[PDB]
Amino acid sequence: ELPQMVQQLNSPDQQELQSALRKLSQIASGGNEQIQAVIDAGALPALVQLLSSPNEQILQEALWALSNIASGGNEQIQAVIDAGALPALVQLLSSPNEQILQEALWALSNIASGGNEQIQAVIDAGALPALVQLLSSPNEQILQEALWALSNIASGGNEQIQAVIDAGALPALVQLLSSPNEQILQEALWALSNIASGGNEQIQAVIDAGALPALVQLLSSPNEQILQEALWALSNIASGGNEQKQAVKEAGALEKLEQLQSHENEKIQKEAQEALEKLQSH
Numbered sequence: 001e002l003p004q005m006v007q008q009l010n011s012p013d014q015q016e017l018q019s020a021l022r023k024l025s026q027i028a029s030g031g032n033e034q035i036q037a038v039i040d041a042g043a044l045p046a047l048v049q050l051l052s053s054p055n056e057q058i059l060q061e062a063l064w065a066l067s068n069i070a071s072g073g074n075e076q077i078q079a080v081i082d083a084g085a086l087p088a089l090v091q092l093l094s095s096p097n098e099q100i101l102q103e104a105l106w107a108l109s110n111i112a113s114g115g116n117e118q119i120q121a122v123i124d125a126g127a128l129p130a131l132v133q134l135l136s137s138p139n140e141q142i143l144q145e146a147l148w149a150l151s152n153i154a155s156g157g158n159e160q161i162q163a164v165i166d167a168g169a170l171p172a173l174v175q176l177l178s179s180p181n182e183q184i185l186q187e188a189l190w191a192l193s194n195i196a197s198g199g200n201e202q203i204q205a206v207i208d209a210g211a212l213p214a215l216v217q218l219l220s221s222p223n224e225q226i227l228q229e230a231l232w233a234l235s236n237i238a239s240g241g242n243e244q245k246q247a248v249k250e251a252g253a254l255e256k257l258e259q260l261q262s263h264e265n266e267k268i269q270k271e272a273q274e275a276l277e278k279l280q281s282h
């Protein structure tokens with residue numbers, strides 16, 4: 001039984017403690033039904049308490065348990081929030097331990113994968129300045145994890161996207177469009193696409209940050225995957241007002257889109273057409 005395992009989390013014997021902690025995280029990784037049974041067993045206050053443990057073996061497993069629980073539904077995510085996990089997770093973004101730092105980013109990214117209430121709770125905990133600073137990390141793993149977290153925050157309402165812009169994420173996201181790293185380029189394109197899925201003001205902020213010359217340059221890429229990612233970001237920008245449409249035209253996207261209508265890849269043909277048609281709309 002699970003409530004017996006929850007009781008073992010404050011056991012003076014480490015083998016007993018760690019085995020219950022491993023089991024609970026293993027169960028938490030097996031779908032929303034199993035996530036609900038771990039929550040119902042009263043595991044969340046005990047897991048959050050284990051976040052201030054100086055024992056890396058405990059901390060790693062407890063962070064792994066909480067990330068998995070935060071991968072569930074919005075009400076399951078909200079329970080991780082209500083158990084007071086966010087201050088400990090934000091504080092853990094200052095850890096010089098790369099293992100702890102990545103797991104802390106996983107947890108925050110999963111919490112922010114929820115609805116606007118869960119996204120806002122991550123913003124309100126003060127995660128944004130740390131996430132923006134991590135966009136400058138020379139560690140690709142941390143950078144990629146930080147970008148997934150910002151992309152999730154930017155997937156919410158206009159007020160949640162405005163928080164990412166107000167944190168100064170756009171100059172760093174635009175610079176990442178010049179990365180020779182295709183994985184980082186995709187995530188930066190995805191984060192910018194999410195911001196561009198907001199209101200005209202959010203779309204304009206992407207343009208004012210200087211994303212259009214880098215986006216237009218990516219339309220000439222011999223890589224069809226990058227092309228698809230750039231077209232998606234452009235289609236979101238083109239969905240704005242006439243002031244936003246004009247800026248894309250002024251960057252020379254039309255000429256690149258019209259050329260992309262004669263591409264071998266049918267998915268490229270389709271998306272370039274919808275983007276070009278959205279731009280030339282009146």
Ligand SMILES: [Ca+2]
Nearest residue numbers: 273274277278
């Ligand atoms: Ca059409």
